[model samples]
Structures are given as structure tokens and as C-alpha cells.
Target: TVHIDLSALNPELVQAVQHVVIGPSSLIVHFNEVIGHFGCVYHGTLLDNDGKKIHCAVKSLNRITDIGEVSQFLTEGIIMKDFSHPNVLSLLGICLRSEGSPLVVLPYMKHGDLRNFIRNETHNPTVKDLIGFGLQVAKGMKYLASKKFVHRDLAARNCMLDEKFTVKVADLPVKWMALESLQTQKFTTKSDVWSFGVLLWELMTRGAPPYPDVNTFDITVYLLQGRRLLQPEYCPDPLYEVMLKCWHPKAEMRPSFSELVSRISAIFSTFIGEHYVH
Candidate 1:
């Protein structure tokens, strides 16, 4: 039941501000610099009231916006409310106080994100772990695809990990594109596959970014020439084929979620069947 109260946050004459908590994570506070950083400064905890720790990220849009833009911004919050997938983070609540600030309540992630975990590890994980992780993500994607949705940005940073390495998707917005343009930009199952493909690389690379150490312009050139990301350090030999399956330029070519799930199980089975007697 988290909601944004305009009277409290006061969007008028203020640029922006936001607050988030774990257990009582519904109400967020916002303040404009005009109001003074210290004036509206917030003291918040990233842990749940029961004292379980979670990752809480405070973010701001890079540009200034008008009320209309702000309204659209809030729509993204609405989308989060509508969608649910095991792989997707639940949009616990939101606040859009009229002419006031905007806020979103999210289920806290205990183990931060996948990017952080892989960044610390120098070695590739065991095949069993890798297959299991891929299966979980594919299952999550299947759920989202069944609902005809796609995550605009799907990457390791957006993939929260639990005490276990199971992945959950986060950061989807309700009205991401403009009303007129929404149709054109709306998420499709195929688009989700593309995003998921990138995520697959995150899993295999052990923490490298989409293009590690490459500058923007250089990457632009590489993309213009139709080049894709190369494998990073510590990727195993077997899973490379599956990653390529996800990156097919033609969306239809990407394996369906069901297909992906089957393939992962097959990989596990094949490895075990080969290494040990059933």
C-alpha cells in the first residue's frame, strides 16, 4: 500500500528527491536542491525492519523534465505494479502524489546483483552451477514471454542474486515509451530474448561488461560492422554454443524459453551421463 503523497514530497518548485526502505519501504521522500540538500536530506536504511540486509539503490534521471514528462515517468512505476515473474522483481508499491514526487517500492534483493558477484570471482563456475543458473533464468524469461512482455534493459546489473545465485529481473517501467510511440517501442518476446542474450554473456564472462575496455565510438564502429561481443575470460567451452543461440539476430532464431529450459537440462544430463554411470 505504498503511495506518493504530494503534500509530503512537494514536487512543485522542486527538481526531485526520493527515499526507499526495505520493510517499511513504501513511502519515499524527495526534495529539490532549491529546498536545500540538508533541508530535505533523508536518513534511510537498506535493511528490512526485521533487520535482514538488502541492496537499495537510489537513482535519478540524468536530465531535467516537465510535469508531463514526470507523469510519464510515473507510468513506468505503474507498469512495475502490473507485472510479476519469478525472474522479475515484484513492484511491491509506489507513490505518485499529485503534482508531487514519484516513488517505487521494490522487494529487497539480499545478495546485491550478479555483476558484483562475478566481478569478484576469477575462475569459471562448475558446469552444474552454470546449467542450473541458465535454467532458472530461462524459466523466468518463459514466464515473462508468456505474458507478452520484455525487459527494456536486461543485464547483469539488473539481475539481482539471492543467498543462492538464482537470478531475478528488475527495473521495468509501466509507460516507458511515449503514448504515441509506445506501440512502436513496446516490448516483444523477441526483444526480451535480445536482452536475455546479453545477460547470458554476463553469466559466461565472469563479470566483464558488454564490451570491456572498449570506448563508445569504437563500439559504435564495431556494431556498425555487425560485430558482436567476444567471449571474455574464464568462460567454459560447452556453454558457448547456448550463448550463441540466444544472440541470433533474427528473434525467431533464438530458442523459445521452453526450448532453453530443455537445452539446459540436456546439458546437465549430457555432462553427468558422460562423466558418470547412470
Candidate 2:
């Protein structure tokens, strides 16, 4: 690793570090260095000692100053730091950045959110590609479930895709939360299972709005009647069946996320074998 002292360089040839570190605690967020911002989340590029460009995403908690929000944010970082999985978003680091709210640093996804990636793409993806993406999400959730971590929010929009189409599950949104969670403010692995089914539907339809024709006010009645999302057009029957099982009225009846990973693996193997067979 190159550790040349910038202090020795001629003043004209060197640039001062933008952040004035008062100690190990104080740091500055140079807005001039930001690449972009989607709402409160900002993107930026950092150069390593090797002069390699590392793209990163920074989420600014500007509106969340309350003690509760601060505690939750810190806890969120702790959970992400311990996780090491290919299909899950990785936490790079954290910064205090002056008097403003703390910033959470995460790996940048060039392709951005998954739903928009599916909707905005000009080319239609093959069925195998769609199934592959779903499998990626299932693998992420399976890892989280094994650790007893309930995602609480699981949807296409909350997931991000990289340039290689690798899907990484992210952020928890109240809107995408399950039915039981809305009323009880409680979350569980089963609740995430419900959201996973909705996520699959989103994949099959190329990001069609869920429950588009149904009235939002009557959703309680709709769910009570065992009415669920229709099978997406051209979706494989077996895959759709798995989605239905995820949406079973009784949460206890829902398949575990681990089971979901196994199910998808079987589906992919069977479909690929048949497609390649003479």
C-alpha cells in the first residue's frame, strides 16, 4: 500500500484533504464531492491509495434527529456490518460528517433499484433471466432468515441490481410491509414471506403496480375473502404455485425462506435441463 506523505509534495501539485478531522470522531462531508442524490441518499466516488475508483452510496439521515431514530440507524448499521453474503447489500462504513445527521456508506448499485431496472430496460428478458433474479432474492432472504433477521420489507423496489444484474435486497418500507404488520406493527419471517410473494409477482409482470385494479380502502375485505394476486401472464405454473403458498392466509402455513431457496433451485435445474435436452 502506497502511504506517501502529501505534506512533502509541492503546494501547487497537491490538494488538501477536504475533511478536517478533529479527532477519531469528527469528519466532514464534502458536498462538492457527491456524484448524485436520490432524495436523501447520495452517491460519490472515492479513490484508494492505488488510485482505483470506488463507487459508494451514502444515505444521509437529515430528517431523523430524534433519539429513537438515531438508535435505530445505529442498530441497522451493526446488523449490516456482520452480514457477508453475495446477494445482500454490504455496508462499507459510517461517517458523522459535521453537525448534520450521520451517513451510512454502502456499495453503489449502478443499475439502481430493481423495479425500475426491470421497467426501464428496452429489451425484454427471457423467462430464465427473470427466474434467475428471483432466485437471487430468495438466496438473500434465506441467509437473513437463517440468522433470525426478519426483513419486514421485501419488494422489488427495495432491492438494487448491479451492472451484472446481481440483485441485492435493501431498505425496509412501511408501504411494502405485510398485512399483519400494518395492523399489529409486528414483524416476523412469515410477514417477509408474504412480501416475497408480492416481489415475485412484480418480477413476472416487469414491475406492474400491485393491486392496481383493487380499491386500497377495501383491501382488508379483499384479503379477508382469500382474494390474492392473479397468476402473472406467461409465468411458469410451478413458480406461481410457490408464490401462492407464500401468500397463504395463515402466516404459519407460509413456506420458510429456506424452503423458498430450495424450491427455486429445483425449478431452475428442471427448466434448464429440459431446455437444453435434445
Candidate 3:
């Protein structure tokens, strides 16, 4: 049994650690595959106390270089563990062995992130499929907003898809961020809404990079100048309108996640009905 000295990091993480800590012996990490700036994710298995075997993803920091990184890592665990939504990724457990950085356990998403999934030419997605994905994401964001939790980072690359193609909004880059977030570093649910608009554009374009013509640092300026991502080829005007609403310059003017849920649901239902009638 290994004990995590939460005091060495952030004190707020103590309660999160107590509820989510998993025994080191309970987890078996198979191979390191996906590497991120702070850590690498490994394909792993977890054996519950009752001997139930579960396939999972384990995220472990590379090395203890900075205290801030460790604090942020644990903070993500804390946030994920507190939320419960079908379209949101859930934290299975946390492994804090004395020998290494903490490991965050999550259900293994077979399809991987939405960006790669859409980019794969072999797996062609229809319009209905795109709207369905958007609806699920909206539902997830709505749940997060209802909890008064702002996702700060929301993008197609961050969202994961399961075997069923169900989109689970996950963990970031600045291109998908809103103007307020870029200017003042104030991240609210509205900023997340702005990112969701960009995600929708990504969906419509089949994973094309947002603002391909502009540099990342200039995105804030572009948006401030009243420029927005153009309507994707073959994308319905009504759907593009939703994206526009999400990108409204005034944060308060942007529709809430609940409103997005309602609007997207209506659009999805209408689309399905039209297809059936054809």
C-alpha cells in the first residue's frame, strides 16, 4: 500500500485521493502508447477487489520534474471523478504508488479520439452521424454546465469515441478557444460553447484543422474582427447557424448548453425525419 502525500502538492486533492485511490497490485499496465506533454497513456487492466477484470487506460506522468504538473494531473483526476454523464469520460480509479507518478484509470475507448476517427477515410460518416455526435457532445456539456463546472478545454481531439461511436467529451489547444478565454484567460461555460462550435465545424469538415489559413496566435484577432469559420462544404445552413450562435462575441449572448441541447435535438430529429421520408 502506497500513501500519497497530498500536502506536498495541493491540499484540495486530499479528499479526491481518499475516494479514488486504487491499490497498486490491482492495476496491470500493458504497454505505453499515447504520449502527451506531461505523461503517457498506457493500455492496462484493472482487477477489482471482487476479481472482476476490466480493460482500462492508465495515464502516468513521465517523471516528477515540477510540482505544478503533479498538482494539475491530480486536479484533472479530481474533476473527472466528480462528474457522471454518459457522454463524459469517467475516472475509474487512481494509482499512487510510491515508486512513480500517479496513474489515472479510465475506461479504454476503442475508437479513440473523434478527430482521428473522422480523419480516417475508411470510416465515412454520414450527415446524420455527424449530428448525432454533436447532440451527444451537447448533452455532455449541458451536464457539465449544470454542475457549474467549466471544461476550459473542449475540442474534437479531446473528445473520445467508444466502440459504439458514442462521443465522450474529454480533455485541449488554443485554436478552439473563445475570444474571452484568449483575451482575459477567463474560462467559463460560454468559452466551452465557443469551442463546441469549432468542434461542430470539425465534424462537418471531417476533421479538417480549424482556421487552416491563419496562425494559432492570430485566431483571437481573427475572431475579434468578426471573422469565423466558414460553413463546411455540404453542411446545412441551419446547422451552420447554430455554430454562429455559439460563437457570438458577447459571452452572455451565446446560447447555454441547455439551449444547445434543445436546438441540436430539434435539428437532429428534423434531419432524421427528412431522411426517412425520402
Q: Point to the candidate with the largest lDDT.
A: 3
State the lDDT of candidate 3 residue by residue for 125-203, as single tens digits: 7787888888889999999999998998788888898876778887737788888888898899999999999999999
- Model 3 ranges with Cα > 4 A deviation: 1-16, 31-39, 63-75, 273-278
TM-score of 3: 0.87
- Arrange candidates, best TM-score first: 3, 2, 1
Sort every candidate by lDDT, greatest first.
Answer: 3, 2, 1
User: Which regions of candidate 2 deviate over 4 angstroms?
Assistant: 1-38, 47-51, 66-68, 172-177, 272-278
lDDT tens per residue, model 1, 1-278: 32244344336323332321122353333333221111222222244457565333333332314555555565565555566666767765444444333444455455667677667665346545545555677777787777766656666676776654557776532111112123355556665665666666766666565665666435434544656667645445556676666656555677787787777777766653121111
- lDDT scores in order: 0.54, 0.72, 0.82
Error of 1 at 271 (Å): 5.4
lDDT of 1 at 272: 35
The sequence of per-residue lDDT tens digits that candidate 2 reaches over residues 58-174 is 677676555455545556666677888888888776653335666777778977887887787685666676777888999999998888888876889889887677888887354
TM-score of each: 0.63, 0.81, 0.87
Can you give the lDDT of residue 70 in candidate 3? 64
Listing every candidate in turn, what is its Cα RMSD in Å to the true structure after a full C-alpha superposition?
A: 8.9, 9.1, 3.9
